[PDB]
Design an enzyme around this catalytic site. Structure first.
Site, PDB file in Angstrom:
ATOM      1  N   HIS B  41       0.852  -1.223   0.000  1.00  0.00           N
ATOM      2  CA  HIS B  41       0.000   0.000   0.000  1.00  0.00           C
ATOM      3  C   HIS B  41       0.883   1.268   0.000  1.00  0.00           C
ATOM      4  O   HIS B  41       0.458   2.287  -0.554  1.00  0.00           O
ATOM      5  CB  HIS B  41      -0.980  -0.079   1.200  1.00  0.00           C
ATOM      6  CG  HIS B  41      -1.606   1.219   1.568  1.00  0.00           C
ATOM      7  ND1 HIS B  41      -2.485   1.870   0.722  1.00  0.00           N
ATOM      8  CD2 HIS B  41      -1.487   1.995   2.672  1.00  0.00           C
ATOM      9  CE1 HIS B  41      -2.880   2.993   1.299  1.00  0.00           C
ATOM     10  NE2 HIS B  41      -2.275   3.101   2.494  1.00  0.00           N
ATOM     11  N   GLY B 143      -2.744   4.785   9.659  1.00  0.00           N
ATOM     12  CA  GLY B 143      -1.294   4.718   9.837  1.00  0.00           C
ATOM     13  C   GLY B 143      -0.839   3.492  10.584  1.00  0.00           C
ATOM     14  O   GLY B 143       0.362   3.366  10.784  1.00  0.00           O
ATOM     15  N   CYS B 145      -1.100   0.469   9.457  1.00  0.00           N
ATOM     16  CA  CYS B 145      -0.599  -0.441   8.402  1.00  0.00           C
ATOM     17  C   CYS B 145       0.834  -0.847   8.781  1.00  0.00           C
ATOM     18  O   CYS B 145       1.666   0.028   9.126  1.00  0.00           O
ATOM     19  CB  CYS B 145      -0.595   0.234   7.029  1.00  0.00           C
ATOM     20  SG  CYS B 145      -2.083   0.088   5.990  1.00  0.00           S
TER      21      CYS B 145
HETATM   22  C1  LIG Z   1      -2.774   1.782   5.914  1.00  0.00           C
HETATM   23  F1  LIG Z   1      -1.730   2.656   5.995  1.00  0.00           F
HETATM   24  C2  LIG Z   1      -3.475   1.744   7.273  1.00  0.00           C
HETATM   25  O1  LIG Z   1      -3.011   2.171   8.309  1.00  0.00           O
HETATM   26  N1  LIG Z   1      -4.774   1.162   7.270  1.00  0.00           N
HETATM   27  C3  LIG Z   1      -5.420   0.862   8.532  1.00  0.00           C
HETATM   28  C4  LIG Z   1      -6.882   1.160   8.572  1.00  0.00           C
HETATM   29  C5  LIG Z   1      -7.079   2.676   8.751  1.00  0.00           C
HETATM   30  C6  LIG Z   1      -8.182   2.798   9.572  1.00  0.00           C
HETATM   31  N2  LIG Z   1      -8.165   1.530  10.507  1.00  0.00           N
HETATM   32  C7  LIG Z   1      -7.417   0.550   9.936  1.00  0.00           C
HETATM   33  O2  LIG Z   1      -7.229  -0.541  10.385  1.00  0.00           O
HETATM   34  N3  LIG Z   1      -5.259   0.629   6.070  1.00  0.00           N
HETATM   35  C8  LIG Z   1      -6.100   1.412   5.230  1.00  0.00           C
HETATM   36  O3  LIG Z   1      -6.442   2.536   5.513  1.00  0.00           O
HETATM   37  C9  LIG Z   1      -6.537   0.663   3.977  1.00  0.00           C
HETATM   38  C10 LIG Z   1      -5.667   1.117   2.808  1.00  0.00           C
HETATM   39  C11 LIG Z   1      -5.772   0.116   1.666  1.00  0.00           C
HETATM   40  C12 LIG Z   1      -5.787   0.770   0.290  1.00  0.00           C
HETATM   41  C13 LIG Z   1      -4.796  -1.036   1.798  1.00  0.00           C
HETATM   42  N4  LIG Z   1      -7.926   0.896   3.636  1.00  0.00           N
HETATM   43  C14 LIG Z   1      -8.899   0.360   4.510  1.00  0.00           C
HETATM   44  O4  LIG Z   1      -8.610  -0.264   5.520  1.00  0.00           O
HETATM   45  C15 LIG Z   1     -10.319   0.585   4.069  1.00  0.00           C
HETATM   46  C16 LIG Z   1     -10.788   1.211   2.938  1.00  0.00           C
HETATM   47  C17 LIG Z   1     -12.203   1.107   3.033  1.00  0.00           C
HETATM   48  C18 LIG Z   1     -13.285   1.538   2.224  1.00  0.00           C
HETATM   49  F2  LIG Z   1     -12.999   2.189   1.055  1.00  0.00           F
HETATM   50  C19 LIG Z   1     -14.589   1.258   2.618  1.00  0.00           C
HETATM   51  C20 LIG Z   1     -14.866   0.578   3.809  1.00  0.00           C
HETATM   52  C21 LIG Z   1     -13.827   0.129   4.609  1.00  0.00           C
HETATM   53  C22 LIG Z   1     -12.490   0.415   4.209  1.00  0.00           C
HETATM   54  N5  LIG Z   1     -11.334   0.153   4.805  1.00  0.00           N
END
Ligand SMILES: *[C@H](F)C(=O)N(C[C@@H]1CCNC1=O)NC(=O)[C@H](CC(C)C)NC(=O)c1cc2c(F)cccc2[nH]1
Ligand SMILES: *[C@H](F)C(=O)N(C[C@@H]1CCNC1=O)NC(=O)[C@H](CC(C)C)NC(=O)c1cc2c(F)cccc2[nH]1
Ligand SMILES: [Cl-]
Ligand SMILES: [Cl-]
Ligand code: NI
Ligand code: NI
Ligand code: NI
Ligand code: NI
Ligand code: NI
Lengths: 306, 306
Positions: B41, B143, B145
């Site tokens: 990502h 963040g 991730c």
């Molecule tokens: C990535 F850097 C990161 O920290 N997270 C963690 C998420 C943020 C909020 N709580 C968490 O656990 N990942 C993301 O933000 C994801 C990025 C993708 C592109 C890999 N996206 C999601 O987790 C996400 C996107 C999304 C949506 F479009 C609709 C419904 C739910 C949803 N989750």
């Protein structure tokens, strides 16, 4: 999203844990600079703990009688002194992993992480509250003595608890790092009784705010209450009276969610009077009182430690 | 005595966390030997994230495009590759704090500790189970991730999870350290439904053994059951099937408490059919399923990590 019983990262404390052995007794010590802190219990034999004269017992102890092991390294003890229920062993080596630290005495209703240790090695980490009756609901076995409780703020470890005792009810008692017990407990091989406990109202409210932050909102109702009307319900359910000081502490969470403290009190009143009717809040079927307002903001805002 | 949601001590994993930045996107990396592991990502911009072609995006990236920071030290990236949904950044420096480690892919029902991190710095540690629906009930913000999940055996850190996604129900999805998702989930900006979840039967039984070990045994009845007759009831309460492997894995706990697995199954069958009727077990009003049989032994026998 999500809300867990979250402990502080334990690495800064792991680097301070050592094994202390005197005669037949082994337990944990905390090595900060050139001092190891441990329960004074370590110097006693069986017949010593009848009604121990620690002043008299310590006079009879050699620096040589203390075996202190930091992993695979023996630390040489060069002096000893007692402060209340804590023994301070001066060693010839300052711990190079000593973090920035403080010794703090916490209030009932505050929380801390415990690093549960045996033979100076960590078993695990969990969160505890100091109960209104000055016990903690720990998880501790034979040899856990000298395990510590702590909070971290940025880079600074605030040590607040050193483990000594298990009560017959299976709850736990200990001291601050100045060796003063929390509560009316003593460091003796005796069955000891805690006062009646109470539910930490301000923490339940904090946790309902956490539920709202995390989108678990079903228990929110259209009702409001006065502080006096709420407290008349609190008393009946063995909840601590909610003070204006508690209302003030919930200010930030109230402002974040847009739910006035006395509106949340109305939702808590309904839950106490009616129960949950088969539902859960943040995966719990009971009202949780071991998260502080600050614990909720820490976890929900992603506060980190350097 | 006592029974807590107990995490592994986090120090060995804290020493491996770094920050990875590619353009405007910052997340966490795991630095082991001379490789940094992070979610792919990180190489997406705005309007890459809804349907990224990660192979195409990675072709356009130079080593210098990856800013890797270990505290206040910048690590020089000398190679990059992608393995499934993880990026492997080869750096010119091996992490001096690399513990003994393995990468493992866990099965549903298995538990692990999560070190939740932001900007390469730890926020806290908690326990998670891999749910039957291949989600985890974490606590994760923007963040998070690249935060990892792990077990320790003695001195070996087994990494089993790297965080990528939040699902609409506020639960979490991620990969093993080879970058293969648990469950049907993808690393894309789209709402992805988790399957309806089930209860981890072997773990509920383990926790009932923890209860008995802690002298909480009100729910023990005078019956036994066959594995067949138990499963016929389980399957009506959204419980997972119990197998003979589950029975043998529970053998040591059965030996410790003197309660045959099938006798404990008869007590669980009565709890499912009749409910807990307002009673608690180990301070819970629900049957807890996020402790494995090993979790119970580790906690109740004081297993430590060196
Ligand atoms: C990535 F850097 C990161 O920290 N997270 C963690 C998420 C943020 C909020 N709580 C968490 O656990 N990942 C993301 O933000 C994801 C990025 C993708 C592109 C890999 N996206 C999601 O987790 C996400 C996107 C999304 C949506 F479009 C609709 C419904 C739910 C949803 N989750
Ligand atoms: C000290 F090394 C130590 O590890 N513990 C931890 C206890 C052991 C079991 N779970 C724990 O938390 N402390 C002790 O064992 C205490 C030693 C004193 C001298 C400080 N003793 C007790 O906790 C104790 C003694 C005792 C009793 F005699 C009757 C009933 C209950 C009871 N608890
Ligand atoms: Cl892939
Ligand atoms: Cl019963
Ligand atoms: Ni969230
Ligand atoms: Ni000698
Ligand atoms: Ni016990
Ligand atoms: Ni390239
Ligand atoms: Ni440059």
């Amino acid at each position: 999203s999500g809300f867990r019983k979250m402990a502080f990262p334990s690495g800064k404390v792991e680097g301070c844990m050592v094994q202390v052995t005197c005669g037949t007794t082994t337990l944990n010590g905390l090595w900060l600079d050139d001092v190891v802190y441990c329960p004074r219990h370590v110097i006693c034999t069986s017949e010593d703990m009848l009604n121990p004269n620690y002043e008299d017992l310590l006079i009879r102890k050699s620096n040589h009688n203390f075996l202190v092991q930091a992993g695979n390294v023996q630390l040489r003890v060069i002096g000893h002194s007692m402060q209340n229920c804590v023994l301070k062993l001066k060693v010839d080596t300052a711990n190079p992993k000593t973090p920035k630290y403080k010794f703090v005495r916490i209030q009932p209703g505050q929380t801390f992480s415990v690093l549960a240790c045996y033979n100076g090695s960590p078993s695990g980490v969990y969160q505890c509250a100091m109960r209104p009756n000055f016990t903690i609901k720990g998880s501790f076995l034979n040899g856990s003595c000298g395990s510590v409780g702590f909070n971290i703020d940025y880079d600074c470890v605030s040590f607040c608890y050193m483990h000594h005792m298990e009560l017959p009810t299976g709850v736990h008692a200990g001291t601050d790092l100045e060796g003063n017990f929390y509560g009316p407990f003593v460091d003796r091989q005796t069955a000891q009784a805690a006062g009646t406990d109470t539910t930490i109202t301000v923490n339940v409210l904090a946790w309902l705010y956490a539920a709202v932050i995390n989108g678990d909102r079903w228990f929110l109702n259209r009702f409001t209450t006065t502080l006096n009307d709420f407290n008349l319900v609190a008393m009946k359910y063995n909840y601590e009276p909610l003070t204006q000081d508690h209302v003030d502490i919930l200010g930030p969470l109230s402002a974040q969610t847009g739910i006035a403290v006395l509106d949340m009190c109305a939702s808590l009143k309904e839950l106490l009077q009616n129960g949950m009717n088969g539902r859960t809040i943040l995966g719990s079927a009971l009202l949780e009182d071991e998260f502080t307002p600050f614990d909720v903001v820490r976890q929900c805002s992603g506060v980190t430690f350097q």
